[PDB]
Motif scaffolding. Sequence first.
Motif, PDB file in Angstrom:
ATOM      1  N   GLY A 122       0.600  -1.264   0.130  1.00  0.00           N
ATOM      2  CA  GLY A 122       0.043  -0.181  -0.115  1.00  0.00           C
ATOM      3  C   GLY A 122       0.692   1.202  -0.265  1.00  0.00           C
ATOM      4  O   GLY A 122       0.774   2.289  -0.894  1.00  0.00           O
ATOM      5  N   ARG A 123       1.717   1.318   0.919  1.00  0.00           N
ATOM      6  CA  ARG A 123       2.854   2.327   0.988  1.00  0.00           C
ATOM      7  C   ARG A 123       3.695   2.514  -0.161  1.00  0.00           C
ATOM      8  O   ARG A 123       4.067   3.573  -0.805  1.00  0.00           O
ATOM      9  CB  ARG A 123       3.606   2.150   2.421  1.00  0.00           C
ATOM     10  CG  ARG A 123       2.997   2.608   3.561  1.00  0.00           C
ATOM     11  CD  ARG A 123       3.931   2.573   4.916  1.00  0.00           C
ATOM     12  NE  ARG A 123       4.255   1.217   5.376  1.00  0.00           N
ATOM     13  CZ  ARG A 123       3.407   0.466   6.076  1.00  0.00           C
ATOM     14  NH1 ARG A 123       2.413   0.986   6.466  1.00  0.00           N
ATOM     15  NH2 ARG A 123       3.542  -0.988   6.440  1.00  0.00           N
ATOM     16  N   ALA A 124       4.150   1.464  -0.612  1.00  0.00           N
ATOM     17  CA  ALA A 124       5.086   1.528  -1.922  1.00  0.00           C
ATOM     18  C   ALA A 124       4.281   2.147  -3.078  1.00  0.00           C
ATOM     19  O   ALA A 124       4.859   2.968  -3.595  1.00  0.00           O
ATOM     20  CB  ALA A 124       5.423  -0.078  -2.232  1.00  0.00           C
ATOM     21  N   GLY A 125       3.166   1.873  -3.033  1.00  0.00           N
ATOM     22  CA  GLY A 125       2.286   2.444  -4.038  1.00  0.00           C
ATOM     23  C   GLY A 125       2.166   3.916  -4.192  1.00  0.00           C
ATOM     24  O   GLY A 125       2.139   4.558  -5.215  1.00  0.00           O
ATOM     25  N   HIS A 126       1.814   4.269  -3.011  1.00  0.00           N
ATOM     26  CA  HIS A 126       1.706   5.896  -2.597  1.00  0.00           C
ATOM     27  C   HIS A 126       3.259   6.568  -2.877  1.00  0.00           C
ATOM     28  O   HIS A 126       3.056   7.661  -3.288  1.00  0.00           O
ATOM     29  CB  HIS A 126       1.310   6.093  -1.069  1.00  0.00           C
ATOM     30  CG  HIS A 126      -0.055   5.785  -1.047  1.00  0.00           C
ATOM     31  ND1 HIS A 126      -1.140   6.613  -1.894  1.00  0.00           N
ATOM     32  CD2 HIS A 126      -0.938   5.011  -0.288  1.00  0.00           C
ATOM     33  CE1 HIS A 126      -2.242   6.239  -1.356  1.00  0.00           C
ATOM     34  NE2 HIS A 126      -2.179   5.383  -0.599  1.00  0.00           N
ATOM     35  N   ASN A 127       3.970   5.905  -2.580  1.00  0.00           N
ATOM     36  CA  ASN A 127       5.714   6.535  -2.530  1.00  0.00           C
ATOM     37  C   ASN A 127       5.961   6.637  -4.194  1.00  0.00           C
ATOM     38  O   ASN A 127       6.285   7.522  -4.494  1.00  0.00           O
ATOM     39  CB  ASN A 127       6.611   5.739  -1.901  1.00  0.00           C
ATOM     40  CG  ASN A 127       6.572   5.738  -0.341  1.00  0.00           C
ATOM     41  OD1 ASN A 127       6.071   6.523   0.115  1.00  0.00           O
ATOM     42  ND2 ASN A 127       7.546   4.692   0.276  1.00  0.00           N
ATOM     43  N   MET A 128       5.623   5.263  -5.015  1.00  0.00           N
ATOM     44  CA  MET A 128       5.922   5.459  -6.252  1.00  0.00           C
ATOM     45  C   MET A 128       5.044   6.430  -6.940  1.00  0.00           C
ATOM     46  O   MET A 128       5.768   6.984  -8.044  1.00  0.00           O
ATOM     47  CB  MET A 128       5.727   4.023  -6.948  1.00  0.00           C
ATOM     48  CG  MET A 128       6.494   2.822  -6.261  1.00  0.00           C
ATOM     49  SD  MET A 128       8.594   3.279  -6.609  1.00  0.00           S
ATOM     50  CE  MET A 128       8.481   3.299  -8.258  1.00  0.00           C
ATOM     51  N   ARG A 129       4.031   6.596  -6.503  1.00  0.00           N
ATOM     52  CA  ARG A 129       3.075   7.473  -7.468  1.00  0.00           C
ATOM     53  C   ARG A 129       3.517   9.109  -7.350  1.00  0.00           C
ATOM     54  O   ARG A 129       3.416   9.735  -8.115  1.00  0.00           O
ATOM     55  CB  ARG A 129       1.698   7.380  -7.109  1.00  0.00           C
ATOM     56  CG  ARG A 129       0.544   8.365  -7.784  1.00  0.00           C
ATOM     57  CD  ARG A 129      -0.625   8.825  -6.992  1.00  0.00           C
ATOM     58  NE  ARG A 129      -1.255   7.716  -6.707  1.00  0.00           N
ATOM     59  CZ  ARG A 129      -2.459   7.151  -7.664  1.00  0.00           C
ATOM     60  NH1 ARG A 129      -2.619   7.526  -8.862  1.00  0.00           N
ATOM     61  NH2 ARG A 129      -2.899   6.043  -7.481  1.00  0.00           N
ATOM     62  N   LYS A 130       3.837   9.363  -6.347  1.00  0.00           N
ATOM     63  CA  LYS A 130       4.451  10.794  -5.721  1.00  0.00           C
ATOM     64  C   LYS A 130       5.757  10.718  -6.346  1.00  0.00           C
ATOM     65  O   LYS A 130       5.957  12.063  -7.131  1.00  0.00           O
ATOM     66  CB  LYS A 130       4.936  10.744  -4.177  1.00  0.00           C
ATOM     67  CG  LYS A 130       5.408  12.114  -3.874  1.00  0.00           C
ATOM     68  CD  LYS A 130       4.089  13.112  -3.640  1.00  0.00           C
ATOM     69  CE  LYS A 130       4.317  14.456  -3.132  1.00  0.00           C
ATOM     70  NZ  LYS A 130       3.126  15.305  -3.271  1.00  0.00           N
ATOM     71  N   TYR A 131       6.589   9.884  -6.412  1.00  0.00           N
ATOM     72  CA  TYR A 131       7.758   9.899  -7.374  1.00  0.00           C
ATOM     73  C   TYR A 131       7.370  10.073  -8.784  1.00  0.00           C
ATOM     74  O   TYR A 131       8.056  10.969  -9.338  1.00  0.00           O
ATOM     75  CB  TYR A 131       8.699   8.706  -7.144  1.00  0.00           C
ATOM     76  CG  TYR A 131       9.929   8.680  -7.685  1.00  0.00           C
ATOM     77  CD1 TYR A 131      11.183   9.037  -6.988  1.00  0.00           C
ATOM     78  CD2 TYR A 131      10.430   7.561  -8.690  1.00  0.00           C
ATOM     79  CE1 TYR A 131      12.405   8.945  -7.254  1.00  0.00           C
ATOM     80  CE2 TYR A 131      11.662   7.581  -9.227  1.00  0.00           C
ATOM     81  CZ  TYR A 131      12.685   8.289  -8.501  1.00  0.00           C
ATOM     82  OH  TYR A 131      14.222   8.097  -8.936  1.00  0.00           O
TER      83      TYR A 131
END
Length: 115
Positions: A96-105
């Motif tokens: 869940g967290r990885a997805g939020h981080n990658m989208r921001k990136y």
Amino acid sequence: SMSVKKPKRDDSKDLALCSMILTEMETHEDAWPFLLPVNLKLVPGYKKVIKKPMDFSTIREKLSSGQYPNLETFALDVRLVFDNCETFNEDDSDIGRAGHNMRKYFEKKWTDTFK
């Protein structure tokens, strides 16, 4: 309209520049949930819930074989990755967290390269 055009934006570098963004997404440490297609035989629920599976390796093959008509279509498939992720994973989970981080990136690189 007919014979009436806004000035021509230079799109000749878009292919290359999308390839760069994608390499950067591929090499990020939190990319691991998104590198390959989710295994639909081994992940109960995925096939029926996620109408349009997407991942980085499928985007790479599409990009390399001229299946993106323009840079916006490429961005739609990258964002579909993260939308899919949010549909299936709790926010408070590693994935869940990885997805939020990658989208921001992604969104930052997109703005800085193209806007």
